[PDB]
Each structure stands twice: as structure tokens, then as C-alpha cells.
RNA sequence: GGGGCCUUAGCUCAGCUGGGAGAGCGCCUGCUUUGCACGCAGGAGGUCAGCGGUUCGAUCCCGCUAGGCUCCACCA
RNA sequence: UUGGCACCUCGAUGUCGGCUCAUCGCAUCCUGGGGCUGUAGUCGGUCCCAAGGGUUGGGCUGUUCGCCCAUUAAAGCGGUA
RNA sequence: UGGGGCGGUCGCCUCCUAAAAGGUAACGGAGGCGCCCAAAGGUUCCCUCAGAAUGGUUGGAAAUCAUUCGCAGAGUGUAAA
């Protein structure tokens, strides 16, 4: 379960998610990965769920590279209060994921094991996913 | 069983499309699935 | 309140 | 140990040693031990009033009871009420184990009011209670008791004293050369217990010493021994010594003719209680280990023997389940024969007639193959039992041999040998590090 | 709805911020005690309310459970 | 349902619970027809099709709700200021 | 004042929100000020900071001293640019 232990500011603007991925577009650590097709906030609970779902089915094999990190906090005002009167308290941490970005990286297993592990990870994520692999021109 | 995720459970399952509805028939009657 | 007590 | 006679000798010695005097300091370093710093004639004295559940005693100690921790509230009230005063007299309430301390203590406002401090040494019912000697209400007690728990003689601050119960005896000293025998009424030989429950404040040790001083116990070869020992107690003719037979120690104010082994002659009771004992600790360790360890080893040996007998029962159940497998294999083709017991079902020809002899239970049942299959499963469990119970019998005889050896090594030896036995055991096995 | 700390021996309950579950009370075993139910040692209980993650070991770290007791919810 | 906003009404839109009269939607309580059951039969569990009809008399509390007594084939959820 | 109350705030300075001139709101997000200094003011003349390593006796990770690598990782009274 992933969170920064110290931040410069505890309350930040929610930002915008226009455009493609700025970086982390190509798979370059593992052999196979998930490429994002839509943009939404990914909570660290979802990241933990996808990581356990991959790691359990890969009980024998290589390690998992988590390419995204939930650095941006989101604030949640308490329920049943009026609008305004100050910004609410921070509740959790999300990672801003753009389309084209690689989320998790797997090497050291077979093809179908990696495909099924990425499918089990993708069924926990709130975004449309696809299977990508390393290209060697090169 | 009626579910919107009609999938072949075993190797003997066969996917058919009766009446515009995706269905799975099998020798095992527990694998009979319909949607819609 | 809104008591209907018109006289 | 401990007793009204030893209490009388202690009162005589305290009247000889600390008469008048001044209580400069009151310390309570432990939960049951109270130290009085008596400044009597000559040098300073250190009176100890102990109310331990097993080691309760009153004597003038000489060693330094260190660790003066933060004092409890009974010690603080003792320093508030008793310190600065004088001791009038130390007397015993009859022949029971009750110590009365008369404290001529000046009050904190300046005037004088005599205080009576009561020390009771009854083993696990020992207590120290201070009264104001005019109304005899309890100012404070060392152990606080409720109206429910120990309903008689409730010890609360401000409650009236109730005084320990009457044992319904006669005073053993200066009684009569005839009163002593006109009430014990020896019939079948409970002599020491009759002395215990017919005399005031007498230990079973003094009764067992008196029945040895009588020699052959008779009608007259017993009261002259009791009067002789009471004359030895009176006129203050005590000979304090420590005697023991094996490890565990005994002390008394009179020389012991029974239960020999050691002499360790002493001068007074103060050095006697200083040397024995401190208070437990090694004696209480060999008390807590000695009988409990051998009891544990003997009980575990009985467990292992019962285990071996019940494992041999399963070894006979092995042959019973082999007969069950034979009867199931008889049933399996069956019902060749009628369902009942399916006995001797075999095909005359084109059959391998095992035709084993069988004992015929009625043959079950609703599910005709699963009964024979259940029999065959019981047989597989039986052969796995043939392996495991023989392993358990081997382990149980190894445990019984080791526990019989431990019984032998506990039933006396060395001291240093027991020390290195402990060493070897702890080595045997690693064992967090 | 918002916040706190626990839920561990038949009971009361420790355990220092991860280094291997304990004290008191209850129940037995043995010793000892002349005698007034006054003493000593030795045994069992716990999946640390429960569930899966982390690391070499988790009451301790984490989420969600399930509870208790906390301390309040200004209105028509 | 509890909320959020304050768009309509402050030259008046009467607000809870009951009584009387009802009507509508099934995300169906029973009755009707089925599939799978770790459905031997009765009784069951889950998921379909189905609103045609019927879905109670009390004790407590202003109470809806809730608890209990006795039945029933069942004593169904909601909308209509 | 996302009704009023209760709570909070009321003047000045710095950053973001502020959309590459300026300006720009919300009970939006972060902080400070109601001073201090006869010098920390003026002029003239010189010099360049913090950290790492090596070596040092009381010096150990750090008191003080030499060396390199140091365009500033220092300092600039007080706080942000």
C-alpha cells in the first residue's frame, strides 16, 4: 500500500488530464505490460489489489515493477455539511494516469501466465487496458 | 443461470446465438448460461 | 411552526 | 516453627533486650516485612515484624535489609503514629501466637496517647494491626480485609477490633500434673494430633518431639515427659539449634532428640532466625521443586504406561480391522450370499474362492458397497496405526526411562551434581538466542 | 454521521513506538506445618476478537471486518 | 432515506400519525408455469416468465418503525404534495 | 456569512489560484507584520560562501586549523517572492 510519508503541501488542485502520456509510454524493464487507453485517477487501493492479483498467480516467477506512484492527494470534505467554509481534509492518494502509460511490468514468466496475470490486474483497474510487449527493431 | 458474462466454463462448452441471445450449451447442465 | 390557527 | 512456646521465649528475650527504648526509624522494604529501628540501652537494634504467608517471624535482625523503596501507606502511618515514642512492655496474650506491643507514643499535636500494636503470626493468616489502646478500634492494618472476604475479624481503619478466635484448649504451662491428661483421652494413637488440638499454641514439631521424649507412649510414660518439657520451657532454659535430615531445615528453641542429622548449636534466637532463614530463598526453591518435580515425573510415567496399554489396545484393533477387511472382501462380490452377513459367499467355479473365515456381523446396508469400502478404509487406518503406535510406544518407554532417572536424581544426591544437571538440561537444547 | 483506545490465562489485564505473550485472582500436583482454613515451589489457558499482505520473526505494521466503552451531536 | 443547491410559492403551497376511499410500478409475499441443484420423497436454496386476484386480529407506545401473542396461502416493497 | 445562530474573520506585506501586459473573486491554498539597528546607516579600501575527504592531543559524526572539488548546494536583522 503506497503513499508518500512527507509532502510539501497536503492540499492540491485536482488538475487536468488532457493529452497523452508525457512519459512511461514504452515497456523497457519487463517483457510485457499494460498500456492505458483512458485517463482516470488510480487509487493506491486499486494498485494494491492489482499487485496482489498478479503476485498470487505468479507465485513462482519474477518480480513486479509498479511504474505508477500515488503522489497526488485528494481532499474529502465530511458528509452532511454545507458547501464552503474551508477545504476539507485529505483522504487518500491517487496517481494521475494518461492514455499510453505503462502501469505494471512483468518479466521472467511465460507468455500465457503474463497475459492471464495482466488480465486479472486489468479487471481491478477502472480504465480500458491492452496488452503490449517489447519491440526490438533494434 | 442468467448472467451478462456468458463464458465457456469447460472445454465441452459451445457458444451459440439463439434468438439474438448469446448462450452456452454443454453436456453438463450446470454450465448452461444465457444473457438477456 | 406554520400553525393553521387563522381567526 | 514456630510456636506459643517460641513466642513466650521471644517475649522473654525482647523484654531482656529491648526495654523502654526509642523507635527512631520505621521501614517496610517488602510487602510483609516491617523493620523497627529500636534505640534501646547500649547500641541500636533492628526489630523485624514479618507477616509472610509462610515465613512470618519476629526477631532482632542484624543484616542490612537493603533496597529502601518508596514506603507504602501502612509504613507512612506507622511513622506518623509510632515514631518518637517509647515501648512500655512486650507481653503475650496468653499462650497463643499473639504479640502485644505497648507503644507510649507522643501524638502529633503534642500530647501523649498510648498505642497498642498487635502482631499475629499464624502463617497465611498473619497480620499487623495497630490500635489506640483506649477504644481498641483498628487505626490501620497491614492487610486490609472486607466484611465479605474473611467475615470474622474484619480489618478496616476505624472498625472495632474483634480479636483472633478461641482454639478451645487449656493453658499448657503451669496447668496441672493431672489436668494435662484428664482431657487428651488417648484411645487409638492420634497422640501428636491430640496434643496439637488439645493444647494452646503448640506446633506438631513439639508434639513429635514430646512423643519421642516419652519413649514408649503409655498412660504415665507421657505426662511426665510433657511436664519435663514444660519445665524446660519455663524458667527460660532454651537451647536453640538447627537440625535437618536432608536439605530441608528445621529450627526450635529446644534441643531435638528425634529427627537427627545435624546439630548447628546457636547462642540466642536472634542469630538463629538470622541464619535460618533468608527467608526462603534456597529452602523455598527446593520446597517448590522437590515434591512437585517428582510428583510431575511420577504422574507423567503413569500417563506413559496408560498410553502404552492403550496403544497395545490399538495393536489388537489392528487384527480386528484385518478381520474386518477379510469380511469386507467377503462382502464385496456379495451379496453373492444373502445380505445377512453375506457369509461364505463364493462362486463355486470361475471364482477365486478366497473363502476366508470371517466373523459375521449382519451385513449392512442401505449402501451396500460403501459399508465394505468403509471396512477397507478402517483397515488402512489400522495399518497406519500399526506404524505410529509402535513409534509412540518406543517414545513412551524412552520417556519412562528418563523420568525414572529423574526420580532417582531428585530422590536426593549431591548439591553440585544437581547444579550441573541443570546446566546439561539447559544446554540440551540451544534455545533462543 | 464525526473523532479516541482496546478487544490477550474461567476473571482484572500488562507487554514503550518488530527482536519471539506475562503479572495478579481461579483450578490441580508435590513438599512442609504439634495447632488457629495465615507457607512454599511446579503444571495446563492465548488462532493475542477475526481475515490476508509485508518482511527473517506481527497484539504491535495495513485495509476491511466485528464489538465494547468512550464524547457531543443549536433549532423551526 | 439522510444530504447538497436555493429554482417556485412568505398581499399563506396547513405541516406527523391514524379513519374513509383508492389507484399505479414490479426490484413478486402467496397462488400459476419453468431452469440449475451438493433436488432420494415432503420441505427447501438460487435464478427466469408472470401485477390476474388476495395480501390479518390484537397488547405496548401520538407514534411510522419496532418487540411480543394467536393465526394465515402470504401477512411484499414503494410512488401518487 | 451557500438563511440566521455558534464558531471564525475584519488593517498592512509575500507567493499560488491569475488564463505568458496590468488587473481579477470565494468562510480558496500557505505564511508573516503592528518591529529592530547609533549601528546592521553614509563613504573609502580589501576579501569571497555552505558542505565531502585526508591529517591533527584533549576532536568522537560534528568546537578550532591547511588542502583540493566547489557559479553558490551559504549568507542577505526579522518572512514569502
Q: What's CA D94's distance to the chain center, in Å?
A: 28
Order of all β-strands in the sheet with B33-34 = B14-16, B23-25, B33-34
The method recorded for this entry reads cryo-EM
Distance CA D223, CA D214 (A): 8
- Are the C-beta atoms of D331 and D371 separated by less than 8 Å? yes
Q: What is the residue whose three cell numbers read 501507606?
A: D73
**Chain E positions with a protein C-beta closer than 7 Å:** 1-3, 20, 29-43, 53-54, 62-63, 73, 76
**Minimum-distance nucleotide, CA of C5 to C1':** F14
Helix or strand or coil: residue A46?
helix
Cβ contact D211 with chain E strand, < 7 A = no
Resolution (A): 3.1
Cβ contact A11 with chain G strand, < 7 A = yes
Residues preceding chain discontinuities in chain B with C to N over 2.5 Å: none
Distance CA D340, CA D334 (A): 10
3-state helix, strand, coil in chain D (%, to 5): 40, 15, 45
DSSP letters along D72-117, please? -HHHHHHHHHTTT-EEEEEEESTTSSEEEEEEEEEPTTS-EEEEEE
Round to a whole number and report the distance in Å from the CA of A31 to the C1' of G59. Answer: 55
**Minimum-distance nucleotide, CA of A90 to C1':** G29
- Are the C-beta atoms of D22 and D84 separated by less than 8 Å? yes
Q: What is the DSSP letter of D2?
A: -
Q: Under 8 Å CB-to-CB from D239, ≥6 apart: which residues?
A: D253, D254, D255, D265
Order of all β-strands in the sheet with A32-36 = A64-66, A102-106, A32-36, A129-133
Amino acid at each position: 500500500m503506497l503513499l508518500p510519508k512527507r509532502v510539501k503541501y497536503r492540499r492540491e488542485h485536482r488538475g487536468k488530464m488532457r493529452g497523452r502520456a508525457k512519459g512511461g509510454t514504452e515497456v523497457h524493464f519487463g517483457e510485457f505490460g499494460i498500456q492505458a487507453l483512458e485517463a482516470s485517477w488510480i487509487t493506491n487501493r486499486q494498485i494494491e489489489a492489482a499487485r496482489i492479483a498478479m503476485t498470487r498467480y505468479m507465485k513462482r516467477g519474477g518480480k513486479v515493477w509498479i511504474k505508477i506512484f500515488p503522489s497526488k492527494p485528494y481532499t474529502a470534505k465530511p458528509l452532511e455539511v454545507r458547501m464552503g467554509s474551508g477545504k476539507g481534509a485529505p483522504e487518500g492518494w491517487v496517481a494521475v494516469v494518461k492514455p499510453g502509460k505503462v502501469l505494471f511490468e512483468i518479466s521472467g514468466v511465460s507468455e500465457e501466465v503474463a497475459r492471464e496475470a495482466l488480465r486479472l490486474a486489468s479487471h481491478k483497474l477502472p480504465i480500458k487496458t491492452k496488452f503490449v510487449k517489447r519491440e526490438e527493431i533494434g | 443461470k442468467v448472467r451478462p458474462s456468458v463464458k465457456p466454463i469447460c472445454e465441452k462448452c459451445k457458444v451459440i446465438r439463439r434468438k439474438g441471445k448469446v448462450m452456452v450449451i454443454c453436456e453438463n447442465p450446470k454450465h448452461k448460461q444465457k444473457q438477456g | 411552526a406554520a400553525a393553521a390557527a387563522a381567526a | 516453627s514456630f510456636d506459643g512456646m517460641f513466642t513466650y521465649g521471644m517475649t522473654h528475650e525482647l523484654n531482656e533486650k529491648i526495654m523502654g527504648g526509642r523507635i527512631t526509624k520505621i521501614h517496610q522494604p517488602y510487602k510483609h516485612d516491617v523493620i523497627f529501628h529500636i534505640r534501646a540501652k547500649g547500641k541500636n537494634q533492628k526489630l523485624l515484624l514479618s507477616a509472610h504467608p509462610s515465613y512470618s517471624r519476629v526477631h532482632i535482625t542484624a543484616q542490612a535489609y537493603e533496597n529502601p523503596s518508596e514506603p507504602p501507606m501502612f509504613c507512612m502511618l506507622l511513622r506518623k503514629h509510632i515514631e518518637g515514642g517509647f515501648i512500655e512492655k512486650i507481653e503475650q496474650a496468653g499462650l497463643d501466637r499473639i504479640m502485644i506491643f505497648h507503644i507510649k507514643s507522643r501524638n502529633e499535636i503534642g500530647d501523649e496517647t498510648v498505642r497498642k500494636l498487635y502482631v499475629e503470626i499464624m502463617g497465611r493468616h498473619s497480620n499487623i494491626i495497630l490500635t489506640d489502646a483506649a477504644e481498641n478500634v483498628i487505626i490501620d492494618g497491614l492487610k486490609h480485609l472486607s466484611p465479605s472476604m474473611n467475615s470474622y475479624r474484619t480489618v478496616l481503619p476505624g472498625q472495632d477490633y474483634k480479636l483472633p478466635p478461641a482454639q478451645d484448649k487449656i493453658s499448657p504451662l503451669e496447668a496441672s500434673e493431672d489436668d494435662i491428661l484428664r482431657h487428651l483421652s488417648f484411645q487409638e494413637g492420634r497422640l501428636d494430633k491430640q496434643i496439637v488440638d488439645h493444647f494452646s499454641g503448640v506446633s506438631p514439631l513439639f508434639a513429635k518431639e514430646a512423643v519421642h521424649r516419652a519413649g514408649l507412649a503409655n498412660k504415665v510414660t507421657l505426662p511426665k515427659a510433657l511436664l519435663a518439657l514444660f519445665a524446660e520451657v519455663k524458667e527460660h532454659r532454651f537451647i536453640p539449634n538447627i537440625t535437618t535430615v536432608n536439605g530441608k531445615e528445621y529450627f526450635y528453641l529446644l534441643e531435638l532428640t528425634h529427627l537427627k542429622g545435624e546439630a548447628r548449636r546457636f547462642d540466642s534466637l536472634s542469630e538463629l532466625l538470622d541464619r535460618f532463614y533468608f527467608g526462603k530463598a534456597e529452602r523455598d526453591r527446593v520446597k517448590q521443586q522437590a515434591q512437585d518435580l517428582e510428583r510431575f515425573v511420577v504422574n507423567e510415567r503413569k500417563k506413559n504406561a496408560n498410553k502404552i496399554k492403550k496403544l497395545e489396545k490399538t495393536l489388537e484393533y489392528s487384527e480386528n480391522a484385518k478381520e474386518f477387511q477379510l469380511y469386507g472382501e467377503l462382502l464385496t462380490a456379495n451379496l453373492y450370499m444373502l445380505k445377512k452377513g453375506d457369509k461364505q459367499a463364493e462362486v463355486i467355479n470361475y471364482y477365486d474362492e478366497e473363502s476366508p473365515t470371517i466373523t459375521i456381523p449382519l451385513n449392512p446396508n442401505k449402501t451396500p458397497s460403501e459399508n465394505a469400502q468403509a471396512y477397507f478404509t478402517k483397515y488402512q487406518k489400522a495399518k497406519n496405526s500399526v506404524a505410529v503406535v509402535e513409534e509412540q510406544i518406543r517414545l513412551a518407554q524412552e520417556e519412562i526411562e528418563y523420568f525414572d532417572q529423574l526420580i532417582q536424581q531428585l530422590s536426593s544426591a549431591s548439591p553440585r551434581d544437581i547444579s550441573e544437571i541443570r546446566e546439561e538440561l539447559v544446554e540440551g537444547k540451544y534455545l533462543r538466542p
